[PDB]
Every structure is written in structure tokens, then in C-alpha cells.
Design an enzyme around this catalytic site. Structure first.
Site, PDB file in Angstrom:
ATOM      1  N   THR B  14       0.824  -1.206   0.000  1.00 50.14           N
ATOM      2  CA  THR B  14       0.000   0.000   0.000  1.00 50.14           C
ATOM      3  C   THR B  14       0.862   1.262   0.000  1.00 50.14           C
ATOM      4  OG1 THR B  14      -1.477   1.288   1.438  1.00 50.14           O
ATOM      5  CG2 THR B  14      -0.230  -0.517   2.445  1.00 50.14           C
ATOM      6  N   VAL B  17       6.214   0.735  -3.975  1.00 51.21           N
ATOM      7  CA  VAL B  17       6.798  -0.384  -4.699  1.00 51.21           C
ATOM      8  C   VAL B  17       8.247  -0.555  -4.274  1.00 51.21           C
ATOM      9  CG1 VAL B  17       7.417  -1.207  -7.013  1.00 51.21           C
ATOM     10  CG2 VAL B  17       5.226  -0.075  -6.635  1.00 51.21           C
ATOM     11  N   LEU B  83      19.166  -8.520  -0.328  1.00 47.88           N
ATOM     12  CA  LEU B  83      19.402  -9.947  -0.143  1.00 47.88           C
ATOM     13  C   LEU B  83      18.604 -10.712  -1.194  1.00 47.88           C
ATOM     14  CD1 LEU B  83      19.461  -8.494   2.855  1.00 47.88           C
ATOM     15  CD2 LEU B  83      19.840 -10.860   3.613  1.00 47.88           C
ATOM     16  N   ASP B 127       5.320  -8.673  12.581  1.00 52.14           N
ATOM     17  CA  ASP B 127       4.920  -9.290  11.308  1.00 52.14           C
ATOM     18  C   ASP B 127       5.987 -10.291  10.885  1.00 52.14           C
ATOM     19  OD1 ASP B 127       2.930  -9.643   9.294  1.00 52.14           O
ATOM     20  OD2 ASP B 127       3.959  -8.265   7.935  1.00 52.14           O
TER      21      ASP B 127
HETATM   22  C1  LIG Z   1       8.978  -6.882  -0.308  1.00 52.55           C
HETATM   23  C2  LIG Z   1       9.768  -6.693   1.016  1.00 52.55           C
HETATM   24  N1  LIG Z   1       9.332  -5.469   1.714  1.00 52.55           N
HETATM   25  C3  LIG Z   1      10.206  -4.852   2.588  1.00 52.55           C
HETATM   26  O1  LIG Z   1       9.909  -4.005   3.415  1.00 52.55           O
HETATM   27  O2  LIG Z   1      11.526  -5.266   2.490  1.00 52.55           O
HETATM   28  C4  LIG Z   1      12.528  -4.391   2.975  1.00 52.55           C
HETATM   29  C5  LIG Z   1      12.643  -3.189   2.006  1.00 52.55           C
HETATM   30  C6  LIG Z   1      13.380  -3.754   0.823  1.00 52.55           C
HETATM   31  C7  LIG Z   1      14.501  -4.542   1.512  1.00 52.55           C
HETATM   32  C8  LIG Z   1      15.001  -5.715   0.784  1.00 52.55           C
HETATM   33  C9  LIG Z   1      14.374  -6.702   0.027  1.00 52.55           C
HETATM   34  C10 LIG Z   1      15.428  -7.591  -0.416  1.00 52.55           C
HETATM   35  N2  LIG Z   1      15.318  -8.783  -1.213  1.00 52.55           N
HETATM   36  C11 LIG Z   1      14.138  -9.436  -1.691  1.00 52.55           C
HETATM   37  O3  LIG Z   1      13.058  -8.972  -1.457  1.00 52.55           O
HETATM   38  C12 LIG Z   1      14.216 -10.779  -2.540  1.00 52.55           C
HETATM   39  C13 LIG Z   1      13.740 -10.582  -4.011  1.00 52.55           C
HETATM   40  C14 LIG Z   1      13.793 -11.899  -4.827  1.00 52.55           C
HETATM   41  C15 LIG Z   1      12.994 -13.028  -4.169  1.00 52.55           C
HETATM   42  C16 LIG Z   1      13.382 -13.200  -2.695  1.00 52.55           C
HETATM   43  C17 LIG Z   1      13.351 -11.884  -1.907  1.00 52.55           C
HETATM   44  N3  LIG Z   1      16.626  -7.122   0.069  1.00 52.55           N
HETATM   45  N4  LIG Z   1      16.340  -6.023   0.773  1.00 52.55           N
HETATM   46  C18 LIG Z   1      13.895  -4.980   2.873  1.00 52.55           C
HETATM   47  C19 LIG Z   1       9.639  -7.948   1.872  1.00 52.55           C
HETATM   48  C20 LIG Z   1      10.788  -8.327   2.789  1.00 52.55           C
HETATM   49  C21 LIG Z   1      10.552  -9.125   1.539  1.00 52.55           C
END
Ligand SMILES: C[C@@H](NC(=O)O[C@@H]1CC[C@H](c2cc(NC(=O)C3CCCCC3)n[nH]2)C1)C1CC1
Lengths: 274, 298
Positions: B14, B17, B83, B127
Site C-alpha cells: 500500500t 513499490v 538480499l 509481522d
Molecule cells: C517486499 C519486502 N518489503 C520490505 O519491506 O523489504 C525491505 C525493504 C526492501 C529490503 C530488501 C528486500 C530484499 N530482497 C528481496 O526482497 C528478494 C527478491 C527476490 C525473491 C526473494 C526476496 N533485500 N532487501 C527490505 C519484503 C521483505 C521481503
């Protein structure tokens, strides 16, 4: 010294130290208004008092008011040469950020615009919140004056269970002490003292050094300077009497002490400066 | 924001992206959480302000790092460590073979270190679920997505009700408790621990009452002895069926006696007795992995 009991969920000295270390990351400048020669300290008192009234109207938590106070004082210390007509915008935007941080269901943006009587548009408030948060390096998690009083009231009313996270203390003495702090925060010289010292010195005035040291960890020598400063404020509160706990439509009674209140404190602030 | 080239969209919520991005000069890859401010009616979303301020103060090897906050145009970019893997996808990829026990132990140990750090900074994650646990190529696993997190006071007051994704939601939340704190995160991690061991969600409910009954059917229907005050909770009903606790030999067959003990303590009904993250690190299940430090009895 540390007044927390042993904690099931973490090392008590660890939790305390982090709390203490935080108060060294969050700086205060009791003289920041010298960066703004066109302002006077009474203007800050009037602005803060107004934010207190706003909080009560919308039933905002005391924590929300004190975050707003802290964001305003720290933001002003980063700026220069602000004029008085800009103060309402900086204050209300500080309260907007604070409400969004703290409340479950904050008031909406237009409501914050609404209470300025049209001196601040929603658009100006959104511009100002970004300026504040960027100038504060997004450091928006201080330990407020009122948060310390919260910690002190739990520790004072600890059972043999030493359960520190579930609240348990009289609402009516909490609000009486908060009233002294609400008066005191109107005077910019309060910033000379760490927020935890301010709160402990208010508690001392409503009890004793033994209780104060037991719940705050500070020795009488740490707070003596603050207590001496708070002296006139405490007497002005004592001459007028202790306030009563208010009920609020839509606020459960076990949370009623956490809602910010407001009274004619600018009148009382004058007497304290005698 | 010129030095970063968006590489791929990896997430959406929400708030906005999430993209993967590559620094054009250094070759460094990061994750960008983009917030479009022209679309937001309340300015910076409460959840972004919270997450930014919390993560500015939560630097730890098992917490995904917030690197930068960039305000450019009508946009706010949160720049994160990147990651390449999450635990949910790793568990599904490992479903037919299983995750080796030493890696399960190493991952749980690391998650408990990250959680112990949150809780000592008085932060609830709220969460914890496998999709929010990120994995790199060097054996590390890290807590991510602090959008639902909240600092708690000492003492707490009443916070946002009905938190945590349903399958990972503690029973005291489901029964409507007024106050809560660190115990809700431990419950989630216990569910995740069992899920790594058995490669199936421990309590996959499809409604609040079905989630609760799935818990009751596995752990036994709680009463005043195992959970003082349970019968006085807003959503408790004397009409709940009485089920008997299941032998953990049948719930987590692969797990040895040490693991069964730790899991039991993470899934204790009573939030006051459920093991803390710090205490869990001292559990014999990890006695091989860790060595305690000398304690100053002063
Ligand atoms: C959408 C995200 N939302 C969020 O708040 O994530 C933080 C902000 C973005 C930061 C983040 C995400 C990330 N790698 C990934 O997502 C991979 C992508 C490929 C498939 C496996 C996962 N590396 N760092 C952590 C939730 C945690 C997964």
C-alpha cells in the site's frame, strides 16, 4: 544507577543503557532561540500551550504532545532567523508527524489544517513535515519528558512480580505530576536539564528523594540543580491545588490518564517567574 | 537518484513499490522502496515514518539495513541492503529434501539474535513470517519489513489490535488481549521454527476462530492453570471444545529432545511465561553453537 527490576525479556542493564545512550543522541539547546533573534521565549510558550489545547480537543496522547515539543525544539536548533508568523506552521507540522507516529487512528491532514483557522494549508503542512523530518535526520524516536514519568510511575508501584510492562499505578497522581511538567516545558530554560532529570525532579516535588532515587536511579546531587529551578513552578501548582482526572468520550478509563489536557497555564507561568 | 539504475520490481504494498537497483559506478546492488508522495493524501505514510525512524536506530547484523533516505521530486526513496532470497522460497525449494538441522539451528539462532536486539531496544516487529526473513549467499538470515513494527513503552499501553499475519498470530492476540509486547514475536518465531522442521505451516488457519482452534487442537485447549486469566479474555468462550495436547513427537518428528523443549517454550500459551529471545539463545539446543560470556555478579 539503574532502577529497573530484572527483566524476563532482556538484560535489565542492557535495556537501561540503551535508554540512557539514546538521551545522548538526542541533543537539546536551552539557548537555541538566540539562533532566531526575532523570536522571544514567550512565543514558544504560547505555541506549546496552543498545541496542548489542540491535543485535548482531538484526545491526543500526552506522548504525542511531547514528541511534537521535542521535534519543534530540535528542529529550531537546526534552523536560523525564523519569524513569528512561521511558528504556527512548524508547530502544527511537528504535531502532525507526532500524531502519525503515536496514535492508532490519527486525525486526518485536513483536520490539522482545520484547527489553524486557515493560517496553514494542508499543502504547507506536507511541505513542512518533510523539512522537519529531513532536518532531524529522521531521528524521530526521543525519550520524551512524559515517557520518563511513565517509567517512574511503574517502578514506584512494582509488586514482588517485578512485571514492568503491564501498566499499574494511580492515574490521579500521574496527571498531577504531568501538570507540573506541562507547566515547566513552557519555559525554554527547562532544556538545560535532561528529560529524565526533569521528570524525576517533578516526581520528587510530589514525593521524596528516597522514592525518586528508587524509581529513577539518580542521586539527589544529580537533580538538585533541576529541583531548585523547578521550585517556583512547583509552588505555583501547589498554591492553585491538584487537578482532577478527566474522563474522555471514547477513551477507556484505564487509558484516561494518557490523554493530553490543557488549562490556563500561561497565567501560572507568569507567577513562577516572580 | 541518478547513480542507481532500476533492475527489477521485487515487491509492492500500500505504501509503494520495492525495486532491485544497481549502482552504475560501484556495481553495488540495493533494494529501493519507492513512495510516490503525489499519490499520498496524508503526506509521508505513518508506516514509513515509523519504519525509517526505527531502522535508523536498529543497526544489527541480522536486521536488513536501511542505507539512505532520499527525497527527490514528489518521491521518497528508502534505500536498503539487498538480499537475494527469502526463507519462504527457501523452504519451498527445500520441501522435498528438507533443510539440514544445522542450518535450521543456525538460522533460528540468528533470528533470535536479531529479535533479542529489537526487544532490548524496545521494538516489536509484529509481522514475523517466512516471507519477511531474508537470506544472503553467505549463510546469514535477517529480519526485514519493519512497516508494522512499533516501539513499546515501559510500561506499554494498548497498541494496534489484530496484528501479525494470521498463521503466525499469537493466541493472546486472537483472544483479544488489551496489552501485549515481546511475546507475540516469539510465538511467530516458534511457528516458523516448526515450519522449517516439518516444511509445512504449523497452524494454517483461514479465519480467526479456525486459527485458534488449530492452535487448541495441537497444544490443547488452555485453561486457568496453564494460562491464568485466559477464561476472562474478551474472545474466550466456555463453549470452546476441549482438545488434548499432542505429543511433540507427532508434531515435529525430526526434532530431538532439545529442540522439542525450546519449541515448547516458544509456544507457551501464557505470554508472561513464554521464553524470551535472550533466554532462548541460552537454551541447550544451541549449546554447541554458542559459548556464554562471564557474568559480573555485582
Ligand atoms: C517486499 C519486502 N518489503 C520490505 O519491506 O523489504 C525491505 C525493504 C526492501 C529490503 C530488501 C528486500 C530484499 N530482497 C528481496 O526482497 C528478494 C527478491 C527476490 C525473491 C526473494 C526476496 N533485500 N532487501 C527490505 C519484503 C521483505 C521481503
Amino acid at each position: 544507577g539503574s532502577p529497573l527490576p530484572v527483566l524476563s525479556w532482556a538484560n535489565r542493564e542492557e535495556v537501561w543503557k540503551i535508554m540512557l545512550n539514546k538521551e545522548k543522541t538526542y541533543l537539546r539547546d536551552q539557548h537555541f532561540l538566540e539562533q532566531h533573534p526575532l523570536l522571544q521565549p514567550k512565543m514558544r510558550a504560547i505555541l506549546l500551550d496552543w498545541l496542548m489545547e489542540v491535543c485535548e480537543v482531538y484526545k491526543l496522547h500526552r506522548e504525542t504532545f511531547y514528541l511534537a515539543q521535542d521535534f519543534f525544539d530540535r528542529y529550531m536548533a537546526t534552523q536560523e532567523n525564523v519569524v513569528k508568523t512561521l511558528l504556527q506552521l512548524i508547530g502544527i507540522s511537528s504535531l502532525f508527524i507526532a500524531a502519525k507516529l503515536e496514535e492508532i487512528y490519527p486525525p486526518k491532514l485536513h483536520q490539522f489544517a482545520y484547527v489553524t483557522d486557515g493560517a496553514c494549508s494542508g499543502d504547507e503542512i506536507l511541505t513542512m513535515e518533510l523539512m522537519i523530518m529531513k532536518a532531524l535526520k529522521w531521528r524521530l524516536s526521543p525519550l520524551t519528558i512524559v515517557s520518563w514519568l511513565n517509567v517512574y510511575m511503574q517502578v514506584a508501584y512494582l509488586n514482588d512480580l517485578h512485571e514492568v510492562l503491564l501498566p499499574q499505578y494511580p492515574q490521579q497522581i500521574f496527571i498531577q505530576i504531568a501538570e507540573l511538567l506541562d507547566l515547566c516545558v513552557l519555559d525554554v530554560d527547562c532544556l538545560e536539564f535532561p528529560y529524565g532529570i526533569l521528570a524525576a525532579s517533578a516526581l520528587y516535588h510530589f514525593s521524596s528523594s528516597e522514592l525518586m532515587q528508587k524509581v529513577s536511579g539518580y542521586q539527589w546531587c544529580d537533580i538538585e540543580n533541576c529541583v531548585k529551578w523547578m521550585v517556583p513552578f512547583a509552588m505555583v501548582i501547589r498554591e492553585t491545588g491538584s487537578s482532577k482526572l478527566k474522563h474522555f468520550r471514547g477513551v477507556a478509563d484505564e487509558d484516561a490518564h494518557n490523554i493530553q489536557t490543557h488549562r490556563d497555564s500561561l497565567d501560572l507561568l507568569d507567577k513562577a517567574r516572580a | 537518484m541518478e547513480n542507481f539504475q532500476k533492475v527489477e520490481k521485487i515487491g509492492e504494498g500500500t505504501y509503494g513499490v520495492v525495486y532491485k537497483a544497481r549502482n552504475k559506478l560501484t556495481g553495488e546492488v540495493v533494494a529501493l522502496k519507492k513512495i510516490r508522495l503525489d499519490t499520498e493524501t496524508e503526506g509521508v505514510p505513518s508506516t514509513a515514518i515509523r519504519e525509517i525512524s526505527l531502522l535508523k536506530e536498529l543497526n544489527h547484523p541480522n536486521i536488513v539495513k536501511l542505507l539512505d533516505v532520499i527525497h527527490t521530486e514528489n518521491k521518497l526513496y528508502l534505500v536498503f541492503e539487498f538480499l537475494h532470497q527469502d526463507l519462504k522460497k527457501f523452504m519451498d525449494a527445500s520441501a522435498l529434501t528438507g533443510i539440514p538441522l544445522p542450518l535450521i539451528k543456525s538460522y533460528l539462532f540468528q533470528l533470535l539474535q536479531g529479535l533479542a536486539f529489537c526487544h532490548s531496544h524496545r521494538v516489536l516487529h509484529r509481522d514475523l513470517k517466512p516471507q519477511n526473513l531474508l537470506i544472503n549467499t553467505e549463510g546469514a538470515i535477517k529480519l526485514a519489513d519493519f512497516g508494522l513494527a512499533r516501539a513499546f513503552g515501559v510500561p506499554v499501553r494498548t497498541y494496534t489490535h489484530e496484528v501479525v499475519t494470521l498463521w503466525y498470530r499469537a493466541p493472546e492476540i486472537l483472544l483479544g488481549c488489551k496489552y501485549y509486547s515481546t511475546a507475540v514475536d516469539i510465538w511467530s518465531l516458534g511457528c516458523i521454527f516448526a515450519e522449517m522442521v516439518t516444511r509445512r505451516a504449523l497452524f494454517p488457519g483461514d479465519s480467526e476462530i479456525d486459527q485458534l482452534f488449530r492452535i487448541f487442537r495441537t497444544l490443547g485447549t488452555p485453561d486457568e492453570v496453564v494460562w491464568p486469566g485466559v477464561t476472562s479474555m474478551p474472545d474466550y468462550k466456555p463453549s470452546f471444545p476441549k482438545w488434548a495436547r499432542q505429543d511433540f513427537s507427532k508434531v515435529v518428528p525430526p526434532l530431538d529432545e532439545d529442540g522439542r523443549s525450546l519449541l515448547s517454550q516458544m509456544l507457551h500459551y501464557d505470554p508472561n511465561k513464554r521464553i524470551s529471545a535472550k533466554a532462548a539463545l541460552a537454551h541447550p539446543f544451541f549449546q554447541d553453537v554458542t559459548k556464554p560470556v562471564p557474568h559480573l555478579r555485582l
